[PDB]
Design a protein around this ligand. Structure first.
Ligand SMILES: [Mg+2]
Ligand SMILES: [Mg+2]
Ligand SMILES: [Mg+2]
Length: 106
RNA sequence: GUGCUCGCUUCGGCAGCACAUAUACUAAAAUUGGAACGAUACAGAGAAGAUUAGCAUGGCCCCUGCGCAAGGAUGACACGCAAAUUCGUGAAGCGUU
């Protein structure tokens, strides 16, 4: 059982160290990136997760589910205009992926 | 500072002219931090039973070496409840238009 925010920040230190180490190990396949972004969005610290998805798109910008998770995080957390920018950049850089167009017109 | 002035004009002073023209990470310091093995306890060396040669691979890990040699335990680390987009059948019971 966790007390006040010192032990909470220690738990966050251990988890972020584990995820950043997994990123340093692999630097490829996005399951580490997505899991670390989901863990950061689950604690309502979504600016960390915005940075995570931007780093992961710097790694691999042609991976369409990464775009889908980043835009559905920004739709889910009521940040409409962020997600709107994300879908516009998505349909600009990947114009043949119909997933982005269907979800953005939806 | 020195020299020259048919300078006052004595050997005292003054005037003029000429040459000579910008050192220093400015400390004999005050400070400010990160650091020496190595001792203290703990700690024990990969490969699916055991005993073991190793060669790699990757990078916000270094050490020895002049080394693009070779060593450092195969130098160490890497060991992960390894889940990424997107579902449908058939009957059976219950309530409903
Ligand atoms: Mg070697
Ligand atoms: Mg050996
Ligand atoms: Mg090696």
């Amino acid at each position: 059982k966790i007390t006040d925010e010192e032990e909470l920040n220690d738990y966050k230190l251990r988890k972020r160290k584990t995820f950043e180490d997994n990123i340093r190990k692999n630097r490829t396949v996005i399951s580490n990136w997505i899991k670390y972004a989901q863990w950061e969005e689950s604690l309502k610290e979504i600016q960390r997760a915005r940075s995570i998805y931007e780093r992961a798109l710097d790694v691999d910008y042609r991976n369409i589910t990464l775009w889908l998770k980043y835009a559905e995080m920004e739709m889910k957390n009521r940040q409409v205009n962020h997600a709107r920018n994300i879908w516009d950049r998505a349909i600009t850089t990947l114009p043949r992926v119909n997933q982005f167009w269907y979800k953005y017109t939806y």
